[model samples]
Target chain A: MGRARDAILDALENLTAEELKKFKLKLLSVPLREGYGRIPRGALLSMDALDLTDKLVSFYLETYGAELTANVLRDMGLQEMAGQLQAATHQ
Target chain B: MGRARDAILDALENLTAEELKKFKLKLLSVPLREGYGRIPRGALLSMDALDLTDKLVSFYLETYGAELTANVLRDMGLQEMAGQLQAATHQ
Candidate 1:
């Protein structure tokens, strides 16, 4: 227990609330980034993080014409969050 | 038959034309919302509709940035109604 969780929890906390906020924000975007926009970030990040990430990346590629690079989170949905938030269309 | 029929029938018919029209509007929106958008708005509320000086929240949620949940009666394919409408998307 000690070895495993200690190894991972730091990495987890490092994700930054700001980052999670971006993901949640994208999901809340209008015109939804994809057919599935209802799933919450906590659900994805908590236990099913890997599976959910795969789904998000798959969706991003399918809908936004983005490359399947690893940092995809940094590009399409994540970065698009602030703009989505600021856009009147989003409100 | 009286009680059951009256209960169900009233619920079905309560929909307003406004709600019904908004559904069709979404059906018409995307100029072709779903590739498989049906002619009559169904699989959703029946008879008349739900209104707010507005309508088809499925039509409305249609793609909210603008996001508020509800509405997306998965394609009833209630074959009986299939003939009543047309398919807007191919492939």
Candidate 2:
């Protein structure tokens, strides 16, 4: 699980500011399953890459982990980053 | 828009049972932003294709719409379906 978290963090660190903004929009859009908490929009908007990645991994690693990170990356047009994440997890 | 909703429904109907199950898991895994309601596990699990798609489109369309549907479809390995959706929306 921590491995998944670390890989997501690394992937997030690779994003530029504009890409990170799109990432936040993608993250903000999905409806959560019950028992998981929602992040307030203001809070999400204010986060740096590391802080955003931390919240994402901490909240979702147990359930979605690397797949969620990779999917969102792909959605943001960062397929190379997503592919690298899959490789890291499979290795 | 209804166009987006229709496109999503079309995509959902394209899923096999196993693929639908994976789609539900993918949807359940993401953390929602504040103000978007979380679907209860039991409710989500009991839904048929149409109901699930309706809930998803109704709840998310105004904000995420086609993009969210395409991303989740791609995550579930339904790129053809996702591509169709994007094409439909852009037309």
Candidate 3:
């Protein structure tokens, strides 16, 4: 129904071998500009008693981020998503 | 069981009518002393299109605070408490 999609589908027919790779690359290239989009950017973790002191500080900051997301989604009546975010820190 | 509780209850015996008011004052005087304590400090809201453009900015900051609380509580396994906080903003 859309021109861009049709063009992509049409082009997909011309090249079948590399089509999947091309599509995957194109798909991954899309930008995530939203605030929560940063979640996938990557975060570092320390295992065991590695810097036990830093653990509290890190958890403090991280949970703050999760709380903000949970509330916003919940306010919008997206309860399940909110619950998931809140649970994100517990683990 | 606790000395502080006994002390307060003991003090309650001497002051009758004013005891309630004094006790309430003493009770309320305890410091919140936590990050979420800032919530009770209050926030400003501009009602109406009086400042339509700034609405997004204001909401952005406020919800960030609320989100921090919700997730922290949830992570602590205080789900109901977290739910109450998430609902705080919706109201």
Candidate 4:
């Protein structure tokens, strides 16, 4: 699980600023369950890309798990990165 | 600002689970500036109420300042709590 999170972190670090912004928007749009709560916009502003990604990956690992996190990457058109995350999780 | 954060924490501690749920919903709905990333749902799920409140108050104080944090409390129908936060910040 931590491997998958690291893989996701690596993928996020590779994203261009534009791509990272898109990724944040996509992440914020995810509908969470009750008690799960959504991320605050202030966090998005204050944290650097890596910090934000670290938090998001940790959260995703706990809530949706690696597979769903990969799916989100795939949705963002980072199929290769998503594949890497999946592989990391499986190993 | 730390005082404001502590005041908000105290106020949150007084809420029932139902009120806390409402507070979380309101928090999730708040629009934030870019780069101030939102809190992850996993954080909400994994953290105890105090932990979650601590994170939120810190974020709010950083992003919106003590005044806005109190305003948010007032919006949540916690007039007395909001006043206390305001007073704490002023003092």
Score every model by TM-score: 0.22, 0.49, 0.20, 0.45
Q: What C-alpha lDDT, on a 0 to 100 scale, does residue B14 get in candidate 2?
A: 72
Residue B59 C-alpha lDDT in model 2: 77
**Could you tell me how far off, in angstroms, the CA of residue A66 lies in candidate 3 after the best superposition?**
23
Question: lDDT at B31 for candidate 1?
Answer: 36
lDDT of 4 by residue, B5-91 (tens): 665565566555666676676666666766566777766655655786678766655336455556656888878767766776677
Alpha-carbon deviation at A77 in model 1, angstroms = 12
Clashes of each: 10, 0, 4, 15
Decide which is better by DockQ, 1 or 3.
Answer: 1
lDDT of 3 by residue, A1-91 (tens): 1112111222223334443343333323343335423221122222211121122123333444344434444554545544554554455
Model 3 spans with C-alpha error above 4 angstroms:
A1-91, B1-60
**What is the lDDT for B55 in model 4?**
82
Candidate with better TM-score, 1 vs 3: 1
lDDT of 1 by residue, A59-91 (tens): 332223122221334444443432322231112
Candidates 2 and 4: which is better by TM-score?
2
- Candidate 4 CAPRI category: incorrect
Comparing 1 and 3 by lDDT, which wins?
Answer: 3
lDDT of 1: 0.32
> Using DockQ as the measure, what is the rank order of every candidate, best first?
4, 2, 1, 3
lDDT of 1 by residue, B38-66 (tens): 33445433434323212333333323301
Docking quality category of candidate 2 according to DockQ thresholds: incorrect
lDDT tens per residue, model 2, A1-60: 256767777888888876776577556655565677767767886799878878887776
DockQ metric for all predictions: 0.02, 0.03, 0.01, 0.05
Output the worst ten-in-a-row residue range by lDDT, candidate 4 chain A: A37-46
